[PDB]
Structure formats: C-alpha cells, structure tokens
C-alpha cells in the first residue's frame, strides 16, 4: 500500500503527514538547514 504523504503548501498541525514540513501555514520543504522541522535524509532505505 501507498504511504501518507501531501504535497508542499498544504498547512497543517504536523509534518508526519506530508513529503516536506508544516511550518506556520503551510507544508514546506525547505525546513533542514536553517529552520529545524524535520530531517529529510535517506535514511528510509530498502
């Protein structure tokens, strides 16, 4: 089965639900460098 993941702009409460990170209204990707939100690394491999 597919895995629960939105695309960016969606805001929201939590980034668990999205391929990137909800921040202050909306679901962003740039959150792994400057602004902590969640990690994007590789690290769900196979």
Known sequence: GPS???ADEKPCE???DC???C????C???T???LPG???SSFXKI
């Not at 921040?23 to 909306?26: A, R, T």
């Open 38 to 40: 969640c990690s994007t």
């Open 28 to 30: 962003a990707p740039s």
């Open 32 to 34: 792994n460098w400057i």
């Open 4 to 6: 629960f993941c939105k």
């Open 23 to 26: 921040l202050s209204g909306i």
């Open 14 to 16: 939590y980034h668990a």
């Open 19 to 21: 391929c990137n990170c």
